[PDB]
Amino acid sequence: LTLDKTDIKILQVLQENGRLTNVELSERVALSPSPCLRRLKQLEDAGIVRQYAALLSPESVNLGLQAFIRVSIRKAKDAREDFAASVRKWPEVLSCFALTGETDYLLQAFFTDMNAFSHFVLDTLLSHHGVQDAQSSFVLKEIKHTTSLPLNHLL
Amino acid sequence: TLDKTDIKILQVLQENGRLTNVELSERVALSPSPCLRRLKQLEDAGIVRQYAALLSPESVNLGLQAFIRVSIRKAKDAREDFAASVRKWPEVLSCFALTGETDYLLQAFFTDMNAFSHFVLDTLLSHHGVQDAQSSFVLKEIKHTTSLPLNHLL
Amino acid sequence: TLDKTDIKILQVLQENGRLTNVELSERVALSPSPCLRRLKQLEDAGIVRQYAALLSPESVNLGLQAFIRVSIRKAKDAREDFAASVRKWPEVLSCFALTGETDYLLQAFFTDMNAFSHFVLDTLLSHHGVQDAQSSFVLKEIKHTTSLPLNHLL
Amino acid sequence: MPQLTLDKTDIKILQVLQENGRLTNVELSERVALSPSPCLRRLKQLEDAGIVRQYAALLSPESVNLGLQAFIRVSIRKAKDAREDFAASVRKWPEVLSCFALTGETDYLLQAFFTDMNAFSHFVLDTLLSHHGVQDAQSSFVLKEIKHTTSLPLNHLL
Amino acid sequence: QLTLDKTDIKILQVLQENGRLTNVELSERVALSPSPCLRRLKQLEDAGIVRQYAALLSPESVNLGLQAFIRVSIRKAKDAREDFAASVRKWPEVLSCFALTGETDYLLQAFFTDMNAFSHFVLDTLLSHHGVQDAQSSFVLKEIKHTTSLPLNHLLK
Amino acid sequence: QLTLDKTDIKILQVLQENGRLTNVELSERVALSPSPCLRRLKQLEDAGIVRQYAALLSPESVNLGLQAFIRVSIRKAKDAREDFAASVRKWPEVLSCFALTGETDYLLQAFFTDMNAFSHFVLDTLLSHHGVQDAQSSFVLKEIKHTTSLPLNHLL
Amino acid sequence: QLTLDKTDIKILQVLQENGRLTNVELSERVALSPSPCLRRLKQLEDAGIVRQYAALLSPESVNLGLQAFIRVSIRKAKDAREDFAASVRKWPEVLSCFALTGETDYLLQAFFTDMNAFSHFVLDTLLSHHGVQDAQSSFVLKEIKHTTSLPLNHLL
Amino acid sequence: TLDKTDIKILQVLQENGRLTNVELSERVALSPSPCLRRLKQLEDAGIVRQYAALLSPESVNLGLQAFIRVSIRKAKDAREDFAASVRKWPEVLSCFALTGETDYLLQAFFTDMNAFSHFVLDTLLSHHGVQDAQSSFVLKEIKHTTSLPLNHLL
């Protein structure tokens, strides 16, 4: 159905604390336990909540190097498919978007250090047949990073 | 200091963060009590910085996802005011000071191309520190996960 | 050769291509009998290539106006085939071979980024001649008129 | 929305008018399968409710000695109303037909016509660049017009 | 090799601007007897310094109102560089050509009547050539300065 | 305005290659008597067709074996584009200078003895100029073709 | 993995600056006994720390007036990265070669006599090589700083 | 004054800077006494500007080699202050004013990406003269020698 302010605040609270209890959740939305849990399921089935996940600290797991790699695919057949299917099998790459502009594709990957990166790029990214060109930048400082989408545009 | 079981939790949790101790204990092949101290222990540390509900963007009218490349003005204030402003802009999820010709990279979600129009013109570029902005748009999500790779710890 | 009076006709007609022979007789200080000949003499010659209804994009749900900067292959007939193709794509209104870094420039209209994505990925780039493309979108229309300047003719 | 108030014939009106904009209700109606009174009804509503914003004559640039079509990319300055004053001034330049605030490296893109490269030189050096807001300009020219129509596509409303 | 002095340099300075002075005139401007003056100038030619005497026309005056600078990029063959060079030599509208450093392989200086004329060249000749991978051209809005004259002061001690 | 006929142009073609001919020598190839042939070339040079006769020297022969094409950016100011234009005119090592379209504001053609002299130029004088915002220079590796001669077939 | 003692650093600081020193001279700079200076040093050399001792010459002194940096791009063909690598190793005019991140695939530092020398190298060697897709070179106008000495205070 | 022998001295010494005169005097086909005579004069002139020990970065924990393309502010003499500063930063081994888009180029070494970040953001960009910096990093070292070519002197 349509989301009303109640359905939003849930999403708002949950995008920030996705491991709450239905009890805690209700206590933060002015809802009764059962009526809360009903509305959350609706939201889940209707694709609105696509996954509950535990966000780790990159540094905590020795992942220092956060890479933004701008690749450029080949003008060949099934080059964009093979590439896509490949990038889906590389755990070091978390995200991947076909972008407007000079950049054909953009990858956000994590690595131990520059060595790890060098090995990745040289012996896997660039080895892929469909990769024609790669060009990568590194994060010096994380100004802001959240998974929480904006929701005021539904009020 | 992490160990093999300690880790296997993280892999499981990263993908299903809303598990029950009983369930998580099961997978990591632990008992609830010793499982729970570990999972806690890991949070105590900061290994897990948050559990979050991940939303479908289109599901919520946000169809337009932009990566903007901003270049900040060269002044002592410029970097901090801008930093403090971008933290207060909810349509922008991420922000990174990068290497290369791009000084700062912004990830943001918007309702449609018009919404973007008002954001950049009436907020982004209006900010005194913002000297120039240059933006691209996602045509296709090939892959998007939040789960870090962990095999380099084994 | 056009005289000051012919010039006034074309200027009036470029702005209201539906104007009556009478009001035209007025705006150009003439009689409707001769005045009509001047216009006929124009259409018939070839100064006036077309009269058109201009619609408002938003009005018909075309909120996304695109400018695509293509690069054609260095093929004997890549130039021909592509040109033939862009002629049949109703989403692309104009197409120019420019000077500079860009080989061709396309101005075209879409419903939304989705409609775009499908066009660029399944039709633009799928075309054999198209080597690479990079497009930018219209945040704001500061001015847009089909009327040419004519003061250089007096 | 355009599916709530528009039906087959209404969309055939706008297709036919976009290409032959200076007819008469009878002439047009004589081509959409209607009559000189009902056709007017639907027609007087399209241009009443914002659809048909203008009827215009389209001239041949070379015909009127305009043989140099230029696509200038301008970067505005980070003053304040730099963006206002520029916008206001672009509208006063007859040589500049269109002006758009685009995404990408370019801030604004102007489409303009001139007589010859001299005319253009004088325009850029003496006007575009002389304006206080214009920080930089870079311009390319049209070598060959592959396709140019003012008519929008409407098949997305069916 | 020759040894050039004040009086020989002046000869070259004077000639680089007035390539049509007589020997007499030239002899008075540099303060020499016509006879040895002449010898000198022939010596200066005989030494390879004076490559050519030419008349310089005003493009505008001969309806070549549009001057271009075309940054062309040559394909990767072996013969591409030579075929292209040898073809550019035969294009009269193309006056100069230079293999430059940086992102440009070759830079061309060419003159045309107008943009139609240019369009016709680029699309039907330059890009038609098998070696030309890509072209990217700009045009002269204003000629702030243009001289054939080399500087020679560095030679004076 | 002068109305150029088939012969007049020839006179320009032949001159553009050999600008030091004797009026007789010219008479003898243009198909004009020494009197008319003479008067015309004057009509031509007075009209503004023939703007000058110059000796063309060999760069390398005079130790100048480093040709530079500088792409410069001028600061947008009231006293900017003027001052720079006037300065470039008094810089002997810069032969030509063009305000061209595209990403470059100005293109400069300049000759130097070596990379060091260049260095001194750009650092101490080109970039020291207050109008000069940015400089980006390349160098000629090989001169495929260089002629002063304009084409004139378009007038036939 | 290292965490060298407060003077073991010093030895490598001094030796990076005066690499032909006599153990006696080395001792009077780090304030050790003349014997422990071949102990501390023995160890360091006997690891991988000191890769080599070289005489550094003055480029203009040997006529190499033209120091150039070349941004090369490999073909995304086959073993292009190998053949090229092995070839750059054989070109003595090319001192350094680094595979960088960014729009540039490879960066080369080289030295030449004058701009001509460079032209011959580029057209007749670099670009002739099968793997080299495009080259793009800038030159050094002025050397602000140049030392072979690595910073070591991060080990204290 | 720089004959064939003097070059065979320099070729040998650039590779083995700590070469025994006994050995050196052999590798050039000289007797010891006149060999020591030639090298001396070669360094008393300036040909041999320094003898130095070259270390292995990885060995000293400097994993990140990096090329920063600086751009100096066109101020009164930012050019001077910056130069004087860059000589005081030991992390930056070399700095060159190059032709092209790049005003200055710096070659510098660091421990890790964080060290780098600290330098750029708190030292490089904080200097008043620095208008912008863009930096690329060494993925792999195909070749690096301090020895110049000398065949051109034969």
Ligand SMILES: CC(C)C[C@H](N)C(=O)O
């Ligand atoms: C798929 C991408 C390469 C599309 C391209 N960036 C464009 O703007 O059209």
Ligand SMILES: CC(C)C[C@H](N)C(=O)O
């Ligand atoms: C802080 C940023 C301006 C850093 C810059 N993008 C770099 O390459 O180091």
Ligand SMILES: CC(C)C[C@H](N)C(=O)O
């Ligand atoms: C209107 C402009 C300031 C827009 C900006 N250049 C962009 O890339 O989106």
Ligand SMILES: CC(C)C[C@H](N)C(=O)O
């Ligand atoms: C048709 C295009 C490839 C022409 C090219 N952009 C030029 O400036 O010459």
Ligand SMILES: CC(C)C[C@H](N)C(=O)O
């Ligand atoms: C005067 C110059 C700065 C003009 C500029 N190159 C342009 O194409 O608009």
Ligand SMILES: CC(C)C[C@H](N)C(=O)O
């Ligand atoms: C060697 C190159 C292809 C590396 C690439 N330019 C990058 O930034 O990762």
Ligand SMILES: CC(C)C[C@H](N)C(=O)O
């Ligand atoms: C002739 C060109 C291919 C030279 C190349 N642009 C360079 O900088 O070395």
Ligand SMILES: CC(C)C[C@H](N)C(=O)O
């Ligand atoms: C010193 C630098 C600003 C010089 C500039 N890179 C040029 O090519 O002229």
Ligand SMILES: [Ca+2]
């Ligand atoms: Ca692209």
Ligand SMILES: [Ca+2]
């Ligand atoms: Ca979408």
Ligand SMILES: [Ca+2]
């Ligand atoms: Ca930058």
Ligand SMILES: [Ca+2]
């Ligand atoms: Ca809009």
Ligand SMILES: [Ca+2]
């Ligand atoms: Ca191009």
Ligand SMILES: [Ca+2]
């Ligand atoms: Ca034309």
Ligand SMILES: [Ca+2]
């Ligand atoms: Ca911009």
Ligand SMILES: [Ca+2]
């Ligand atoms: Ca002109």
